[PDB]
Design a protein around this ligand. Structure first.
Ligand SMILES: Cc1cc2nc3c(=O)[nH]c(=O)nc-3n(C[C@H](O)[C@H](O)[C@H](O)COP(=O)(O)OP(=O)(O)OC[C@H]3O[C@@H](n4cnc5c(N)ncnc54)[C@H](O)[C@@H]3O)c2cc1C
Ligand SMILES: Cc1cc2nc3c(=O)[nH]c(=O)nc-3n(C[C@H](O)[C@H](O)[C@H](O)COP(=O)(O)OP(=O)(O)OC[C@H]3O[C@@H](n4cnc5c(N)ncnc54)[C@H](O)[C@@H]3O)c2cc1C
Ligand SMILES: Cc1cc2nc3c(=O)[nH]c(=O)nc-3n(C[C@H](O)[C@H](O)[C@H](O)COP(=O)(O)OP(=O)(O)OC[C@H]3O[C@@H](n4cnc5c(N)ncnc54)[C@H](O)[C@@H]3O)c2cc1C
Ligand SMILES: Cc1cc2nc3c(=O)[nH]c(=O)nc-3n(C[C@H](O)[C@H](O)[C@H](O)COP(=O)(O)OP(=O)(O)OC[C@H]3O[C@@H](n4cnc5c(N)ncnc54)[C@H](O)[C@@H]3O)c2cc1C
Lengths: 179, 179, 180, 180
């Protein structure tokens, strides 16, 4: 039900060490005259966000590994600004009988010579999956804010919050956003 | 296992009647001097394609309704240049026993008060689905060429070919592409 | 300065004759319980971020502006474009421009290629471009570029697009309180 | 004319220390049977259109070019950009430019806003921009813009990017027969 950091933008310019520092640096050198540049990074970035100066948040890219189900991943897949890879600052009773029954038929179909990509189709949407999700920091911002809101279903909320915790760790922007 | 036309680009400029005619017209007025403009539309467009002048094929947008399974739709969903909407020129024996068993549990779970979005999760990937797929003619071109190739699985090939037939009907480009 | 409609989405299915009717149709077969007004349904869809019903429609506009403003418009990367080939301050803008066009003409006359001569043209030089995007993309482009912060010439162009948007999508406009 | 690397993807997981190692890692946990050379695996991935392994890496380059070429580069809409503020034919290009810069300076000195004065600047005027995209997007940008058909100044800029790409992704370059 979780997420881990796989990869993130690392700058190689002098005096810019992290992804967040590049975003703040792009903000500042866009408008060198701006008195706004004299703010803390989180102060500056609050305004960049408020002004819709989104391109500074597209200098950075992060990728996360998500562990979720096939039902939720299909929903996550709909955030088309992201890039995905897939691999091969009573109710809980009847499901378990059916799930065990499906995996039995799955494991035996493979053993009987049926390949993989045909056997896959009998698996339920509750089947766990692992995907990479990659996108700019701009896109992570609006995915997280949306999918941690009331209007999205519980298991997606949990998934997005796992992402939120990693985001907060890597990124002044989490304070700018009042997260 | 099929597709239908739902909607397509209709120009409102004078002497340009169809989506294909706008693409050919954009090609021609991009470079009014070009002796290439004296070709038939399919002759002109063959070259636009060959030269990678892709933006003329992004003046037109088409949308199709696809009937397929949840397994295939999840794969189709990965063509992220497209926009999707979802709604609520022995092996064939064991599957049918399990599928009937899942739908029984699905129908009864709803009848027992479980809602919908929880019951959904027990459904197999073989479950039929209806989606809209919308994108520019450029994107339709490269989706169709890819997903009608050897390297993609049979049921996706059939789906892409249903799309191909509609494309051929609406669009000189089908001849330019040697379809 | 101006905008003209070139092309728009038209549904081919029975009972749905306009791009917006298709948008509304999509929002309807998504309402088990909310059957309020037509524009009220769309407003509700917009408010809950169900964007994809608005990505079923697509519209192209021809914009007439300067190269300088066009470069800014090009930054709205969800859109697809097509380009084609061809006070005292107000007084001295006219002399340089005329003097720039004079040399431009001379160079073309004296054999020099179109793409080399183009480089002497100022950012104020007129250009016409197609801008194509889903209805979703138009909403946030117009929204953004009509609000203070963007420069005057750009505000004017975005207000020209908004006028066309409202004619084609009168029910979304109502949902957004957009008026002529 | 030139390009400089600003930033690139670095994996944080054990055993994978570069963007390309992560790309290669992704292509490996996708090979049940093909275990040929490292660059040979990627070539195979590229040939079967498995693009998404190449969308795990992302790189930013700072480009120095003219406004005219930058407007063309802006058309590669899969990329994200950032802009910042600040023969006889060769003889008369120098006079107009100097004369355009003279008035530009005068206008700024006499109170006129930066955004109004900018419009008298020719398309040849220097600019620096960030260009950020997945490794996939770089491949087809470089591929396209290094080939005959695109104009000289643009070919030169795309060859400057290719040089940096090859330094960072030596194994993809090998897979594509790209050399310095
Ligand atoms: C309540 C709800 C109900 C839904 N119902 C359905 C349904 O019935 N059927 C169906 O098919 N789909 C449905 N969806 C899916 C929805 O239509 C979208 O396709 C998906 O949820 C969000 O993807 P997106 O297109 O915004 O993609 P994203 O990849 O997240 O965003 C696309 C681009 O928009 C930008 N963006 C997003 N928000 C902002 C912002 N605030 N400011 C600036 N840029 C922004 C992003 O940064 C990104 O660059 C529903 C979604 C919601 C939340
Ligand atoms: C054999 C194969 C194996 C795969 N294996 C995996 C896997 O193991 N795991 C996984 O997660 N995914 C896998 N995929 C998915 C793949 O990585 C892509 O994400 C998806 O198949 C194609 O989507 P796309 O990104 O090209 O999207 P699209 O929406 O189809 O295209 C994106 C953009 O690229 C453009 N484009 C595409 N081709 C051209 C062209 N020739 N010329 C100009 N423009 C073009 C389109 O027009 C569009 O604008 C596999 C795909 C293939 C075919
Ligand atoms: C000969 C030439 C003449 C042109 N003339 C005009 C003109 O007169 N007017 C005008 O407006 N425009 C013109 N164009 C511009 C052109 O139409 C494109 O808009 C511009 O080159 C941007 O390319 P792109 O959209 O593919 O952008 P990109 O951002 O480079 O690509 C978009 C997406 O497509 C994918 N993709 C591209 N190629 C492949 C591929 N081979 N396989 C898999 N994926 C791929 C990329 O990875 C990326 O994700 C011309 C282009 C050419 C080269
Ligand atoms: C105040 C201001 C100053 C700027 N200064 C600079 C500068 O100095 N240098 C520089 O390089 N750039 C600057 N920019 C440009 C800016 O950073 C963007 O690159 C440009 O405006 C394009 O916007 P966009 O990427 O959202 O494009 P769009 O194509 O308009 O949007 C991309 C996608 O995001 C979606 N989206 C946008 N808003 C929403 C939303 N509210 N809800 C749901 N979806 C949404 C759209 O529907 C679309 O699908 C500035 C912008 C502003 C307004």
């Amino acid at each position: 039900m979780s997420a881990k950091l796989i990869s993130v933008t690392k700058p190689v310019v002098e005096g810019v060490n992290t992804a967040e520092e590049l975003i703040a640096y792009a903000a500042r050198v866009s408008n060198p005259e701006n008195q706004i540049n004299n703010k803390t990074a989180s102060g500056l970035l609050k305004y960049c966000i408020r002004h819709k100066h989104w391109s500074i948040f597209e200098t950075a890219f992060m990728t996360l590994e998500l562990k979720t189900s096939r039902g939720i991943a299909a929903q996550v897949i709909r955030h088309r600004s992201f890039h995905f890879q897939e691999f091969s600052p009573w109710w809980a009773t009847e499901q378990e009988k059916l799930y065990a029954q499906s995996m039995e038929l799955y494991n035996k179909a493979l053993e009987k010579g049926i390949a993989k990509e045909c056997a896959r189709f009998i698996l339920p949407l509750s089947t766990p999956t692992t995907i990479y999700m990659s996108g700019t920091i701009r896109d992570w911002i609006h995915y997280i804010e949306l999918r941690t809101s009331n209007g999205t279903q519980r298991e997606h909320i949990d998934l997005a919050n796992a992402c939120k915790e990693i985001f907060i760790k890597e990124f002044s922007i989490a304070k700018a956003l009042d997260w």
